[PDB]
């Protein structure tokens, strides 16, 4: 049920079976035996359990957090606004971590799926993770154990001052 856009998978191209020898293929009979012995009972059990679940279907909801004023607009020693901004920044940190995780998952799956052509056919995912990693490192790395929204803001300001100095 995962979104294909979020977790892209290249379309599957499976070669058709083209036997050229008379000898019977053991894999085919073994797979048929496995089907009959295992897959059918398992499919029946899941049919039963899905029927039971459909008998009592109930829904759980994904929470929505409205955007709150950032530390940038929070006043000094204004503990309420600083608190809200800090919790929001922590949630954003978690979301960014998850995004990095998604990109890394794509990278691993593409390495495995391509096979011996991983170096060439996974280049796009490698570039995506390159960009995401650079952004994440710039945003969050070196903040330290006691990372806080204020420290991230300070890092951003240091970076922008360096950029202005580079602009000379």
């Amino acid at each position: 049920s995962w979104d294909k856009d979020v977790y892209p998978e290249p379309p599957r191209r499976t070669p058709a079976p083209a036997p050229q020898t008379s000898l019977p293929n053991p894999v085919t009979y073994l797979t048929k035996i496995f089907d009959l012995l295992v897959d059918r009972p398992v499919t029946l059990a899941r049919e039963f359990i899905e029927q039971q679940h459909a008998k009592n279907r109930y829904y759980y909801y994904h929470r929505e957090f409205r955007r709150v004023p950032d530390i940038t607009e929070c006043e000094e020693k204004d503990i309420l606004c600083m608190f809200e901004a800090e919790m929001q920044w922590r949630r954003d940190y978690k979301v960014d971590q998850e995004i990095v995780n998604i990109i890394q998952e794509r990278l691993k799956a593409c390495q495995q799926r391509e096979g011996e052509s991983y170096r060439q056919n996974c280049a796009k995912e490698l570039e995506q993770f390159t960009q995401v990693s650079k952004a994440f490192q710039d945003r969050y790395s070196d903040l330290g154990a006691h990372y806080s929204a204020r420290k991230c803001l300070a890092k951003q300001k240091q970076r922008m001052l360096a950029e202005r100095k580079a602009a000379k």
């Binding site: 990095v100 993770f129 390159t130 990693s133 994440f136 490192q137 969050y140 790395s141 070196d142």
Partner: protein, 128 residues
């Protein structure tokens, strides 16, 4: 004249090649007799306690207690600050600390210099 066997600290001289085993005197035999007497007395006492049907528990060996006490307790009371003790303590205590400080400080400074120069690769180093 086969090549001789040079004894070392980790290769002791065999009793067979001991120059003293073949130069025996009456006093040496007397000393061996005395040592055998000592060992016999100790073995007698130990076996008397060991074969006792009434005994229940460890046979407290004074030698073991002495060994533990000498290894643990007696060290400081029988210590005197002397030039050898002081110099060896200074060396093996602080010298390694300063050596590692030097090594790690130089490494850290080199890394920071490369980072400031923007001449270090951290392309995917996003987990510190």
């Amino acid at each position: 004249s086969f090549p001789k066997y040079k004894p070392s600290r980790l290769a002791t001289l065999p009793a067979t090649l001991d120059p003293a085993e073949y130069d025996i005197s009456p006093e040496t035999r007397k000393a061996q007799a005395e040592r055998l007497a000592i060992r016999s007395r100790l073995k007698r006492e130990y076996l008397l306690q060991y074969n006792d049907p009434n005994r229940l528990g460890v046979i407290e060996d004074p030698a073991l207690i002495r060994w533990t006490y000498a290894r643990s307790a007696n060290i400081y009371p029988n210590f005197r600050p002397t030039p050898k003790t002081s110099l060896l303590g200074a060396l093996f205590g602080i010298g390694p600390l300063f050596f590692w400080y030097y090594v790690f400080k130089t490494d850290r400074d080199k890394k920071e210099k490369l980072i400031q120069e923007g001449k270090l690769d951290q392309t995917f180093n996003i987990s510190y």
